[PDB]
């Protein structure tokens, strides 16, 4: 019953939506999270994909989208809640 902010830079590739509000759909008795993944390079921020995510251990009871990876190619953060795909940070 979750809801995230769906964003996709490859909308023209697969004939999909570049943004919008995505209502989450998942299995029963299972939690549903939101995810945000972007590209950071020398102070420039370029979001690639935001949306829904199935049950995952890495984002249990997190109210914000904080990426803990130390300098990966694409930053990723998982958050449990409603509309937690609004903002993001790279605090490791």
């Amino acid at each position: 019953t979750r809801e995230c902010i769906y964003y996709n830079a490859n909308w023209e590739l697969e004939r999909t939506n570049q943004s919008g509000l995505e209502r989450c759909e998942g299995e029963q008795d299972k939690r549903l999270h939101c995810y945000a993944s972007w590209r950071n390079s020398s102070g420039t921020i370029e979001l690639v994909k935001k949306g829904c995510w199935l049950d995952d251990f890495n984002c249990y009871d997190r109210q914000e989208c904080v990426a803990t990876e130390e300098n990966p190619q694409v930053y990723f953060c998982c958050c449990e809640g409603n509309f937690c795909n609004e903002r993001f940070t790279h605090l490791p």
Partner: protein, 104 residues
Amino acid sequence: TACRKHELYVSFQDLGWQDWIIAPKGYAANYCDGECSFPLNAHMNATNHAIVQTLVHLMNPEYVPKPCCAPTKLNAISVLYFDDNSNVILKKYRNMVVRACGCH
């Protein structure tokens, strides 16, 4: 020893996929192990054919082997992986983690 869903966390870092898997960097893929012996209880989820096979195994322990502790319920996991042209792609891989087990 009995049919029991054991716990196993497999990390893509040691599976050589760290170059094309953005996240998750490792998920809990519980493996199923144990032994199935007569009788097959309520929790050891069994079929009619499993019971018939484990009954034939009683008389002929060499001709027919015992049923196998195998998964019965599976769940999908979301994977955000790279493509061949360095394109980020999300996919819900079905039948990845084990939720239950039983004699097959």
